[PDB]
Amino acid sequence: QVQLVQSGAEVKKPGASVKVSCKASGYTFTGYYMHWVRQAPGQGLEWMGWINPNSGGTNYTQKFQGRVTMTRDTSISTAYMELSRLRSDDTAVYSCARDMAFSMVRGSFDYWGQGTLVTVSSASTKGPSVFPLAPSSGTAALGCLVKDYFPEPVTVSWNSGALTSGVHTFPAVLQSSGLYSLSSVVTVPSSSLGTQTYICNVNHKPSNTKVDKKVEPKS
């Protein structure tokens, strides 16, 4: 029975390098090409390259050339993937996949590793900037943009918690800068906007940041 056991999860900072291992068992390690695929959280699969454990030859896709290095040690039946000069959007689960063809590369994978999560987090804490999402100019929407913060999470309430009906706080994006951004929107009918006060309460504990932004129509 084929088993591809990869090394444990790694936490890295931008500019560093990481080395992922992948030990095979249950088959002649030199008989099948090994592929490397990564998958960002919530996103899709991305092919990185392949190595032949027999000959040692490799091939990398264009976007990883100059940063990726695939090696193998036949005495321990282990393949290695090294990624240098890491950035935020390199945060993904890296997996080794065995080519199902014998001694040929054909791109169809029949056995996968459990994956190795590689997290490239921001290098320092940062409190968010809070901007008002002014209502457009029969429903009307207003909200608060909680921009560029790290790490998770932030808590957004409206009117000290006295405004919950119609509030939807969206999950944050992880921008390629490594900073999170979030938006929280209140929906009221068009014909009742300027009746009440709308103040969003943004709290970011890791940076000791507490902001109260009053949202209102413009001009």
Next chain:
Amino acid sequence: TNLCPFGEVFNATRFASVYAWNRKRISNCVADYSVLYNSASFSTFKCYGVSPTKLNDLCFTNVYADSFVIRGDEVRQIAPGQTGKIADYNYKLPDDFTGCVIAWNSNNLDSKVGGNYNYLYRLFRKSNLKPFERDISTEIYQAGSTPCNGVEGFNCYFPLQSYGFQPTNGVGYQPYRVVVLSFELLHAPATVCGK
């Protein structure tokens, strides 16, 4: 009075891969094939075109000792008119072969805990070998129609594959050391005689 150096062929310290099978040319000496046949170290000892008991009393001009290493289930391929990866791409015996095929299990010597990857065999080749032909090229096998230009990859295979050779392997997947003695009767002074 020289004895034929069969010791340095059978009791050689290390053996060759089957794709680069070693050949020793025995000449101008006296050998006793009965002692080889007497030894029970051999699990395979089949002769073709000549009997082993009538071998220590027949003179030949030259004796060739081919030695290599293959795995268990491939030992049967070292015979005239056999098919397989070894007989087609690595070591082929002619149909009018006159000689003996000797093999013995070398799992105690040619196996490593973790795998011995030094013994190779040719897996891809454009055509079959002629009898007694050796192919040691390391060119990329062009399987498709697009040329490979020495670049390994899609439809561009590396022609050599390594045996696993682990001690825990099944007998059919364990290493075997093979010695093929071929006798030639060139119209010439027969020097290699038996005693």
Next chain:
Amino acid sequence: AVLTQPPSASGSPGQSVTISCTGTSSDVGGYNYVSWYQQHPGKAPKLMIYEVSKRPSGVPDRFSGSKSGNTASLTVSGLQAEDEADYYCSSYAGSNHWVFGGGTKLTVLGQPKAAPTVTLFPPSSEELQANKATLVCLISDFYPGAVTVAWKADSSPVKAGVETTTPSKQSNNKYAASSYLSLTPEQWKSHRSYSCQVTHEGSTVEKTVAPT
């Protein structure tokens, strides 16, 4: 060069659904080495189709692949609940490189299809005064939970500065997502309008904002 794959394919139990995968003449339409993978959440992908139409052993006959031109297709007849997963196509792309598709979520319809509601916000005057600008496109109350977001400056596409959340389940078992377009204040005021296009089950919902 990514393989274009629809964001959401869906169907009722027992129905037949087709997931497309459009490449170019140098990958899908060039070689008969298209593959299909099935990924349940949190698990490793499973090979379902290789070489356009061949099935590995154990894969149900309900899954069948085919290819026409630069477009491959994975068809699932007799849709069942366990078929709800993400499906990725793959193809050889020449020069010893393989490429994946964007991925399609296949949802077994448990409730009627809900089109996404889109609300687009322009950059606030405070952010513009900080020499920054961000468009916020908020997508909510859509089912099944998969969507492609496309941004447009004037009428030409925009791919730089786009960040989009993956769909997340709401409290009503529908889904929501958000997309952000980071701009400079000069780019925001140069073009006459920016648009957020949201594709879901063939139809597209578009919202547009203009300077000032």
